Structure 1
Amino acid sequence: RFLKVKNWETDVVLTDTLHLKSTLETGCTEHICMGSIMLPVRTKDQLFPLAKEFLDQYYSSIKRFGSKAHMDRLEEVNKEIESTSTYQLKDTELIYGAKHAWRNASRCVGRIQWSKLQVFDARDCTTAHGMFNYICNHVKYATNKGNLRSAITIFPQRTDGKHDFRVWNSQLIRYAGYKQPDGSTLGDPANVQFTEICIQQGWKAPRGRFDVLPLLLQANGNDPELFQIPPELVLEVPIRHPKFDWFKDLGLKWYGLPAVSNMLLEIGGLEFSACPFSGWYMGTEIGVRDYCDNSRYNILEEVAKKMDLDMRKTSSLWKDQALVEINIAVLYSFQSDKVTIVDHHSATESFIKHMENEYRCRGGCPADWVWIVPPMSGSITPVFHQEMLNYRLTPSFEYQPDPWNTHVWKG
């Protein structure tokens, strides 16, 4: 079967055949669409078929499908599964797998970059201290003094689900949040609960608006342990505005390295529950979401106050006005300090070209419109007008529940 997507701005029509390779379920049915729902121990039995699909994909990509080397590898993996109930990926397979999870990530606007990914193999890691060292190195390599490079660090896979490696932080670098007795929050409201766990674990909190959280790291299913990232490894940008000189006195800064640490990487049936990865920011993630969400730093009022905007009626678009200025400041600040950042115009335009290329060479590009369209100025970006098909390919990145909800405390 063949499915068409249309771009309503250009009349370009594309044909999807790749969706035929899709296995996992979407959440949707013929009766209900769940496209805006945020979240819609394997046996030998189910594992070998998952391994086989994967290795067939891998061997096709290197143009060796059906080769003696392909067949020997199937036999070898088969025999490893029947003997040990699991198997180990070769380095080449791990790299290919991790690149493809990113390529298959339908919510990611940054995928033009998928084939340039530094893979760090951390499968020999055994302790929390080991994990801290690997992560420090990842941070330093990725930051590259402002000239950001994409990377992922892959810790040992799940075995019986009782010995999982996990990073408890949702991102490697994030700011503390402190709920006050009067109901107000200091710092990032998104991180209150995690900040609380850190404090209970023995973190001494500075209690300011921008305290970089400590890493909380779990190796081999053990209770997690705290570590401070060396501050000299944590690149930060003070936010100022090209024309507004009072902007600096708001006291805003942000970190340069966005690095997701709470997802699960699946490759050929194997589950890597600790696989932190990082790229670089699109400006709107900080300027729109982190600064302007009501449940985040929520700076719209204060910025609009200082701007002397008419704040008495929403119909003045004071919020919209202040939002643009904040986002201008973020892009200007990163650019001035030579820290890699991309604006939402350039990022969406590059995504469109990537997507078209993927249709020509791969037969499709799964994409989640709800996420791909930026959270400001939607329809003046070309993605707004782009019909997209969303479906699940493996290898993949998956959401996993926060570990403090599941962990068996050992004491």
Structure 2
Amino acid sequence: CPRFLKVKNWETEVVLTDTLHLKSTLETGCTEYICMGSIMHPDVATKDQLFPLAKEFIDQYYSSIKRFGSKAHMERLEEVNKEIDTTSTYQLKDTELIYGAKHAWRNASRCVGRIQWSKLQVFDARDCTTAHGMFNYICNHVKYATNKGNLRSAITIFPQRTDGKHDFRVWNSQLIRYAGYKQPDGSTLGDPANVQFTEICIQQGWKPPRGRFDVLPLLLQANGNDPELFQIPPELVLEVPIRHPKFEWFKDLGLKWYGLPAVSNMLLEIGGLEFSACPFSGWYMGTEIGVRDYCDNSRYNILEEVAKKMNLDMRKTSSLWKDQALVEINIAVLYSFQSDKVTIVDHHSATESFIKHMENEYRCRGGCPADWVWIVPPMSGSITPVFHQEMLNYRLTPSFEYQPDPWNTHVWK
């Protein structure tokens, strides 16, 4: 691979030079003859696999605290190696855990919000042993992160994988989501994105209220055991009713959303260790609610209704009635969150911050991996500064990774 790679911004003419890509450790899925950059997704480590991965991480950590080659560095290497030698694994120090979690976010090429990466509150839950204990840790995370609407980014890290038969998992895809119910006539009540998980909860014993906005229970698996249901205390679930600064009729749609986006189905990888339960949360970009959650066809799909109540012609697509209604919904989402003092960021501000962040990372770190397909917002792409920004995508570790859905792999006791 070439040692310097240049990326250009076609609006400002700024050219940046990337050297960090040389530290890339994982495959992208592309080859020299095919690019898979729009593909959504393109047994444990042996002793011998784990040694180099741990040394790589430990070296990186000691370089970061400006103690590379030191006595403490060499001692840590020796102590990790003895642990892997005698137990086939090792334990991270608290300092290393915190560093590893912050850098998995810093390295998340699909995240536009990384300007905040170093202000992450890390909760160490590696002493957890039961689903009830997982529920306690998750409730504390939700309350801290919500902070009465002044949201704070946070991650809670449960015990790492051992033999793969004792995994901790949150079966929910996010800690707070709304249920969806397939009706016998084919329609859906609630959130169509969550029909399958809702059905799993109902089999596991949940009594569904069967409304549009029913917070799903937590489904928590500790130490490889069968998962258990818990209702999040509703006073911990901050919600915002959606209204519009101009259209008085918008509140009559009866929409609301929850304040806290907390993804709970990803895997955190640090120094070859695998943390299969690591829920993390930030705050929303408005389009994540207003474009995707409401207007996606396999979601709430109320573009039609808003268009109708706006009395747009819906016969010609070239009237752009869909585009007009989409902007209005996203105006309402941003207005409702700001009015209730719940942290939210519009797509103009977020993308402007990410450009400043990318520039700083190129300056101080030698690069910033970024996935243009995900960084550019799902509406008004070209009037945001990331549209004209060239980006290089590559995979650094520590990292957040995808993992299979637990119901496809769980061995029922």
User: Counterparts of 1:205 and 1:295 in 2: how far apart (Å)?
Assistant: 21
String of CA shifts for 1:296-339, please: whole Å, max 9, x gaps.
00010000000001111000000000000000000000000000
1:39-58 correspondence to structure 2 within 5 Å: 39-40=41-42, 41-58=44-61
1:232-256 CA deviation, whole Å, 9 max, x = no partner? 0000000000000000000100000
Deviations 1:138-181 (A, max 9, x none): 00000000000000000000000000000000000000000000
**CA deviation vs aligned residue, 1:74-128 (integer Å, no higher than 9, x gap):** 0000001000000000000000000000000000000000000000000000000
Rounded Cα–Cα distance in structure 1 between residues aligned with 2:34 and 2:190: 39
Aligned CA RMSD, in angstroms, stands at 0.3
For 1:27 and 1:301, the matched residues in 2 are separated by 38
1:274 to partner: Cα distance: 0.1
* Residue 212 of structure 1: how far off its partner (Å): 0.2
Residues of 2 paired with 1:385 and 1:407: CA distance?
44
Cα deviations across residues 271-296 of structure 1 (Å, max 9, x unaligned)?
00000000000000000000000000
Partner of 1:254: helix, strand, or coil?
A: strand
Structure 2 distance, partners of 1:20, 1:405, is 36
Partner Cα separation in structure 1 for residue 51 and residue 105 of structure 2 = 23
The structure 1 residue matched to 2:317, chosen from 314, 319, 322, is 314
- Residue 4 of structure 1 deviates from its aligned partner by 0.4
Provide the C-alpha distance between the structure 2 equivalents of 1:361 and 1:313, rounded to a whole number of angstroms.
51
Residues 178-203 of structure 1: CA distance to partner in whole angstroms, max 9, x if unpaired?
00000000000010000000000000
Consecutive unaligned residues of structure 1, counting only runs of 5 or more, are none
Large movers: runs of 4+ above 6 Å: none
What SS class does the counterpart of residue 386 from structure 2 fall into?
Answer: helix
Q: Counterparts of 1:23 and 1:152 in 2: how far apart (Å)?
A: 24
Give 1:276's aligned residue: 279
1-structure distance, mates of 2:270, 2:371? 21
Q: Give the Cα–Cα distance (whole angstroms) in 2 for the partners of residues 114 and 160 of structure 1.
A: 31
Distance 2:167 2:277 in 1: 8
Q: Per the alignment, in what secondary structure is the counterpart of residue 135 of structure 2?
A: helix
Q: Does 1:178 align with 2:194?
A: no
TM-score by length of structure 2 reads 0.99
Q: Distance in 1 between matches of 2:395 and 2:8?
A: 21
Which residues of structure 2 form unaligned runs of 5+? none
Partner of 2:412: 409
Mapped to 1, the partners of 2:197 and 2:335 lie a distance apart of 31
CA distance in 2, matches of 1:21, 1:46: 18
1:347 aligns to what?
Answer: 350
Q: How does 1:144-159 map to 2 (within 5 A)?
A: 144-159=147-162
- The alpha carbon displacement at 1:222 in A equals 0.3
SS in 2 for 1:384: coil
Deviations 1:31-79 (A, max 9, x none): 1100000000110001010000101110001000000000000000000
Give SS of 1:217's match. strand
Q: After TM superposition, give the deviation of residue 344 of structure 1 in Å.
A: 0.1
Kindly provide the CA deviation profile for residues 342-389 of structure 1, in whole angstroms up to 9, marking residues without a partner as x.
Answer: 000000000000000000000000000000000000000000000000
Q: Identity across aligned pairs (percent)?
A: 97
Paired with 1:26 and 1:271, the residues of 2 have a C-alpha distance of 19
| Paired residue secondary structure (2:294) | helix
Query: Which secondary structure state, in structure 2, belongs to the residue aligned with residue 226 of structure 1?
Result: strand
Secondary structure of residue in 2 paired with 1:242 = coil
- Aligned partners of 2:236 and 2:79: how far apart in 1? 42
Q: What SS does structure 2 have at the residue aligned with 1:137?
A: helix
TM-score (norm 1): 1.00
Matches of 1:242 and 1:263, distance apart in 2: 37
Q: Which residue of 2 aligns with 1:7?
A: 9
SS at structure 2 position matched to 1:120: strand
Equivalent position SS for 1:305: helix
Instruction: Give me the whole-angstrom Cα distance separating, in 2, the residues matched to 1:312 and 1:397.
Output: 44
Number of positions where the alignment pairs a residue of Structure 1 with one of Structure 2: 410
Q: Equivalences for 1:1-400 in 2 at 5 Å?
A: 1-40=3-42, 41-400=44-403
Return the alpha-carbon distance in structure 2 between the equivalents of residues 391 and 46 of structure 1: 21
Give how far 1:23 is off: 1.3
